[PDB]
Design an enzyme around this catalytic site. Structure first.
Site, mmCIF file in Angstrom:
data_model
loop_
_atom_site.group_PDB
_atom_site.id
_atom_site.type_symbol
_atom_site.label_atom_id
_atom_site.label_comp_id
_atom_site.label_asym_id
_atom_site.label_seq_id
_atom_site.Cartn_x
_atom_site.Cartn_y
_atom_site.Cartn_z
ATOM 1 N N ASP A 139 0.855 -1.219 0.000
ATOM 2 C CA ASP A 139 0.000 0.000 0.000
ATOM 3 C C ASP A 139 0.877 1.250 0.000
ATOM 4 O O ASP A 139 0.460 2.276 0.602
ATOM 5 C CB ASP A 139 -0.951 0.040 1.194
ATOM 6 C CG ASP A 139 -2.107 0.993 0.955
ATOM 7 O OD1 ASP A 139 -2.242 1.447 -0.214
ATOM 8 O OD2 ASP A 139 -2.856 1.279 1.930
ATOM 9 N N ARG A 143 0.372 9.299 0.181
ATOM 10 C CA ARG A 143 -0.474 9.382 1.410
ATOM 11 C C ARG A 143 0.147 8.519 2.531
ATOM 12 O O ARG A 143 0.059 8.902 3.660
ATOM 13 C CB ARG A 143 -1.933 8.938 1.188
ATOM 14 C CG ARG A 143 -2.130 7.457 0.869
ATOM 15 C CD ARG A 143 -3.580 6.994 0.621
ATOM 16 N NE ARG A 143 -3.583 5.658 -0.014
ATOM 17 C CZ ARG A 143 -3.546 5.413 -1.337
ATOM 18 N NH1 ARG A 143 -3.528 6.394 -2.232
ATOM 19 N NH2 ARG A 143 -3.501 4.164 -1.763
ATOM 20 N N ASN A 144 0.779 7.401 2.232
ATOM 21 C CA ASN A 144 1.290 6.500 3.296
ATOM 22 C C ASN A 144 2.767 6.784 3.623
ATOM 23 O O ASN A 144 3.470 5.865 4.076
ATOM 24 C CB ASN A 144 1.059 5.038 2.917
ATOM 25 C CG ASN A 144 -0.412 4.705 3.006
ATOM 26 O OD1 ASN A 144 -1.092 5.377 3.775
ATOM 27 N ND2 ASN A 144 -0.881 3.715 2.236
ATOM 28 N N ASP A 157 1.462 3.038 7.484
ATOM 29 C CA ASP A 157 0.272 2.252 7.085
ATOM 30 C C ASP A 157 0.720 0.862 6.654
ATOM 31 O O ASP A 157 0.793 0.603 5.430
ATOM 32 C CB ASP A 157 -0.590 2.968 6.043
ATOM 33 C CG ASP A 157 -1.994 2.381 6.016
ATOM 34 O OD1 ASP A 157 -2.132 1.185 6.362
ATOM 35 O OD2 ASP A 157 -2.936 3.108 5.679
#
Ligand code: N86
Length: 307
Positions: A139, A143-144, A157
């Protein structure tokens, strides 16, 4: 068969820490942690589950806790401990500037080539460490990644993270809500995940940074991505990117997984480029850019417990 996982999971008393304010809605708080019987204050982010009546959700937060406790690298987020109150709480290092995705969107006019390329290096170091730990993130996305300082980012994450099959050097999943626009072709088609599928998403993440947080394949439905990839189409060259940078992103998006760069090679290629950033990214005005008692405050990075 494999090396034992001797990571320590630290249980914290809820009285060891104070929630100062809310950062996001379970719920994340900015807070302070006083290790019991230690004269130190550690800025923390405290993730607290809402309902706490969900056995499913409780399994998912503990998986994350399992993985974050088992990693120790300057470019991967670390868990300080958990608190087993009515609602399970994860205490981690505060990352005060938030996600790198938001940070590049908010600061698109202040970010020079030296920061973008150093971030590409740091995320490659993070991902190479994970590969060393036989861990597949599954993932990776801008964003992570979180911003401790504009100089220092960390992969976060681990909710989707899984081990590689040594005997089976690939992972095999079954359903959910998934990040199609970040995933390797073999992942979208055959739910196959490896370190090399992590390199595809590393490529997309670099494209987010180099476009100051643009949305990959914006306006294209998730259903259409596999077809587009099979037709050999890829994300376009960002305006700031020299062909050198873009060609690396393109190699991460090869259909043959073993033809993609390794994280160790990405460390090397981005570092060479990091030694002369204006040769490798062309940015308007790049030359002219810069980015109670706190007495016993120390950052989590300076808070080490014996191994
Ligand atoms: C590296 C520990 C970690 O994962 N920190 C973390 C998680 C969420 C979050 C939200 C807002 C600000 N800082 C953090 C930090």
């Amino acid at each position: 068969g494999e090396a034992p996982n001797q990571a320590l999971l630290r249980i914290l008393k809820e009285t060891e820490f104070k929630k100062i304010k809310v950062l996001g809605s379970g719920t994340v708080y900015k807070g302070l942690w006083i290790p019991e019987g230690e004269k130190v204050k550690i800025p923390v982010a405290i993730k607290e589950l809402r309902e706490a009546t969900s056995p499913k959700a409780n399994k998912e937060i503990l998986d994350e806790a399992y993985v974050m406790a088992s990693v120790d690298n300057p470019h991967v987020c670390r868990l300080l401990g958990i608190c087993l109150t009515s609602t399970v709480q994860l205490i981690m290092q505060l990352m005060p500037f938030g996600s790198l995705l938001d940070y590049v969107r908010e600061h698109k006019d202040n970010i020079g080539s030296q920061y973008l390329l150093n971030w590409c290096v740091q995320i490659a170091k993070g991902m190479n460490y994970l590969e060393d730990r036989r861990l597949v993130h599954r993932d990776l996305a801008a964003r992570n990644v979180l911003v401790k300082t504009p100089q220092h980012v960390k992969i976060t994450d681990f909710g989707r993270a899984k081990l590689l099959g040594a005997a089976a050097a690939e992972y095999h999943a079954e359903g959910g809500k998934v990040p199609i626009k970040w995933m390797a072709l073999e992942s979208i088609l055959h739910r196959i995940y490896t370190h090399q599928s992590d390199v595809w998403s590393y490529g997309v993440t670099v494209w987010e940074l180099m476009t100051f947080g643009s949305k990959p394949y914006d306006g294209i439905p998730a259903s259409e991505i596999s077809s587009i990839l099979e037709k050999g189409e890829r994300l376009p060259q960002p305006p700031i990117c020299t062909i050198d940078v873009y060609m690396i992103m393109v190699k991460c998006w090869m259909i043959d997984a073993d033809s993609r760069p390794k994280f160790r090679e990405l460390i090397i290629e981005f570092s060479k480029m990091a030694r002369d950033p204006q040769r490798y990214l062309v940015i308007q005005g790049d030359e002219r850019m810069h980015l109670e008692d706190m007495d016993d405050v120390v950052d989590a990075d300076e808070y080490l417990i014996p191994q």
